[PDB]
C-alpha cells in the first residue's frame, strides 16, 4: 500500500479558498499544507484511489512521487501561469493538457469486461465471490481481482454480460 | 453576527474514502450523502474568499443545516434519480451537465475582486492595527461588498490594489 501514481490535487478540507488563490508560486511546504492529492495505490486498482493529505498518508512508500507531482503539477505549473510574460496560448495549452490527462484516468475505474471469477475462502468460516476485471484502456497486466458484489454495484450490465 | 451555512456551492468525494463509493449505480440516500461527500460552504457574513469544504462531521452543530440537506436532495439525490434512470436520454445528461457547469462558473466570479471601494485601518485588541479594504466582488455586487484584510487582498488581487492606490 504505497504511492503508485498521483493523479490530481484539490484544495484541502476545512481550509479557506483564498489560500490557493494567491498570486505567488507555492513552496513544497505550501503544497503539503494547502492540498489533497488523489492517490493510486500500489496494491490496488483505480477503484480504490483515495484523496489524502501529507498528514493522512503518514509514513508511506513512494513519497518522492507525491513530491514530484507537487513540483511538476503545482509549483512549475504556477511558475508558468503566474509568469509576467505568460501568454493566453500557454494557458489554454496547459489547461487542455491537464484535462486530457484527467480524462484518461477516468477510464481506469470503468470495467471493460470481466475475465474470470473465483470464490475466495476467508479466515472466518466464510467465502466471497471475486471477479477478474479488465479495465478500460489499461491492459491485461492490470486486470485486477475485485469483490464480486462491488463490481455489480459499479458495473451491473458488464456483470450481466458475464453472467 | 454568526457563522452558519449561507450557500452550499458544490460537493466532492470525501477525503480518505475510495472512489468506488460514489461510483455505484444506485441512487444515494441522505445517509450516503453524509458519509461519502464533502461540501463547499459559503458562510453567512463571510465573503466567498472564505468558503471551505466540510463534511457533516466537521461542520458539527451548525446553523443553516437544512440548506445542506436541500443541497443533497436536489444536487445529489435528484440528480442521480435522473441520471441512473430508465428512460434517461443523452440530451438530459448534456443539459444537466451544462446547467451544473454554468452554475459553478458563476460562483467562480465571486472570490475575484472587481474594485476596492474604500480602506480603513482596524484597531485590534492587542493594541496593534490592520488595514482593511472594502471589496466589490465580480458579479455580486454592492450590498455584498465586504471588508477584507488588506494584505490578503494583495496576495489575491495585487493589480486591483495598484489601481486603488494610484
Which residue, of A64, A79, A109, is where some domain finishes?
A109
**Are B54 and A14 a contacting pair at CB < 8 A?**
yes
- In this structure, the answer to whether residues B98 and B156 fall within a common structural domain is no
**Are B48 and A17 a contacting pair at CB < 8 A?**
yes
Q: Which residues contact A25 (CB under 8 A, 6 or more apart)?
A: A75, A78, A79, A82
Whether A146 and chain B come into contact, CB under 8 Å, resolves to no
Which residue, of A109, A132, A151, is where some domain finishes?
A109
- Unique residue bearing C-alpha cell 493538457: A97
- In this structure, the answer to whether residues A99 and A63 fall within a common structural domain is yes
Strand order in the sheet with B113-123: B113-123, B129-137, B146-149
Query: Do the beta carbons of residue B40 and residue A15 sit within 8 Å?
Result: no
- In this structure, the answer to whether residues A87 and A128 fall within a common structural domain is no
**Are A109 and B23 a contacting pair at CB < 8 A?**
yes
Whether A160 and chain B come into contact, CB under 8 Å, resolves to no
Q: Which residues contact A121 (CB under 8 A, 6 or more apart)?
A: A127
Distance CA A4, CA A105 (A): 13
Distance CA B113, CA B161 (A): 10
**Preferred mutation among B10, B15, B153 to probe A, highest tally of A CBs within 10 A:** B15
Whether A65 and chain B come into contact, CB under 8 Å, resolves to no
Distance CA A150, CA A133 (A): 11
Which cell goes with B43?
Answer: 458562510
Which residue, of B93, B111, B129, is where some domain finishes?
B111
Nearest chain B residue (CA) to A35: B15
- In this structure, the answer to whether residues B43 and B1 fall within a common structural domain is yes
Distance CA B141, CA A34 (A): 29
Residues of A in contact with B24 (CB under 8 A): 153-154
Q: DSSP secondary-structure letter at A117? A: E
* Beta-bridge partner residues of B131: B121
Whether B19 and chain A come into contact, CB under 8 Å, resolves to yes
Distance CA A30, CA A19 (A): 9
How many helical (H) and strand (E) elements, i.e. helices and strands, does chain A have? 7, 6
- In this structure, the answer to whether residues B129 and B104 fall within a common structural domain is no
**Are A24 and B55 a contacting pair at CB < 8 A?**
no
**Are B18 and A156 a contacting pair at CB < 8 A?**
no
Closest alpha carbon to B53 in B40, B64, B65, B43: B40
- In this structure, the answer to whether residues A9 and A54 fall within a common structural domain is yes
Residue B24's Cβ-side half-sphere holds a number of Cα atoms within 13 Å equal to: 17
Residues in chain A, total = 163
Residues of A in contact with B55 (CB under 8 A): 13
Q: If you count residue pairs, one on A and one on B, with CB atoms under 8 Å apart, how many are there?
A: 81
With residues binned 3-state (H G I as helix, E B as strand, rest as coil), the percentages for chain A, rounded to 5, are 45, 25, 30
- In this structure, the answer to whether residues A13 and A43 fall within a common structural domain is yes
Q: DSSP secondary-structure letter at B135? A: E
Distance CA B159, CA B153 (A): 10
C-alpha distances (whole Å) from B134 to each of B70, B80, B111, B116, B121 are 32, 41, 13, 6, 11
- In this structure, the answer to whether residues B79 and B146 fall within a common structural domain is no
Closest alpha carbon to B143 in B166, B122, B117: B117
Distance CA A65, CA B126 (A): 44
Alpha helical stretches, state H, chain B: 30-36, 56-59, 65-71, 79-84, 90-109, 150-156, 158-164
- In this structure, the answer to whether residues A73 and A17 fall within a common structural domain is yes
Query: Do the beta carbons of residue A114 and residue A131 sit within 8 Å?
Result: yes
Distance CA A133, CA A155 (A): 10
Rg (CA), chain B: 20
Question: Domain containing A135: what range?
Answer: 110-163
Query: Do the beta carbons of residue B37 and residue B13 sit within 8 Å?
Result: yes
Residues of A in contact with B155 (CB under 8 A): 22-24
Phi-psi region at B103: left, alpha or beta (left = phi > 0; alpha = psi -120 to 50): alpha
Distance CA B96, CA B79 (A): 8
- In this structure, the answer to whether residues A70 and A143 fall within a common structural domain is no
Residues in chain B, total = 166
- In this structure, the answer to whether residues A100 and A122 fall within a common structural domain is no
- In this structure, the answer to whether residues B107 and B125 fall within a common structural domain is no
Which cell goes with B28?
Answer: 444515494
Task: Looking at the complex, report in whole angstroms how far the Cα of residue A57 sits from the nearest Cα belonging to chain B.
Answer: 9
Q: Resolution limit in angstroms?
A: 2.2
What is the total count of domains within chain A? 2
The CATH number of whichever domain residue B33 belongs to comes to 2.40.50.40
Q: State the sign of the Cα–Cα–Cα–Cα dihedral B78, B81, B84, B85.
A: negative
Q: Could you tell me the end-to-end alpha-carbon distance of chain B, in angstroms, rounded to an integer?
A: 34
Which cell goes with A40?
Answer: 493510486
Report the run of H or E that residue A95 belongs to, with start and end. helix A88-107
Residues of B in contact with A50 (CB under 8 A): 15-19
Task: Looking at the complex, report in whole angstroms how far the Cα of residue B156 sits from the nearest Cα belonging to chain A.
Answer: 5
Closest alpha carbon to A32 in A72, A3, A74: A74
Query: Do the beta carbons of residue A132 and residue A116 sit within 8 Å?
Result: yes
Which cell goes with A87?
Answer: 501568454
Amino acid at each position: 500500500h504505497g504511492i503508485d501514481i498521483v493523479i490530481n490535487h484539490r484544495l484541502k478540507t476545512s481550509l479557506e479558498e483564498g489560500k490557493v488563490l494567491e498570486k505567488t508560486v507555492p513552496d513544497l511546504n505550501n503544497c503539503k499544507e494547502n492540498y489533497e492529492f488523489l492517490i493510486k495505490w500500489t496494491d490496488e486498482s483505480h477503484l480504490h484511489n483515495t484523496w489524502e493529505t501529507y498528514e493522512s498518508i503518514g509514513q508511506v512508500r513512494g513519497l518522492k512521487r507525491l513530491d514530484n507531482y507537487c513540483k511538476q503539477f503545482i509549483i512549475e505549473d504556477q511558475q508558468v501561469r503566474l509568469d509576467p510574460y505568460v501568454t493566453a496560448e500557454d494557458i489554454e495549452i496547459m489547461d487542455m493538457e491537464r484535462e486530457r490527462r484527467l480524462d484518461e484516468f477516468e477510464e481506469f475505474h470503468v470495467p471493460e469486461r470481466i475475465i474470470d471469477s473465483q470464490r475466495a475462502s476467508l479466515e472466518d468460516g466464510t467465502s466471497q465471490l471475486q471477479y477478474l476485471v479488465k479495465w478500460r484502456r489499461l491492459n491485461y497486466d492490470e486486470a485486477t481481482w475485485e469483490n464480486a458484489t462491488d463490481i455489480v454495484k459499479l458495473a451491473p450490465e458488464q456483470v450481466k454480460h458475464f453472467q
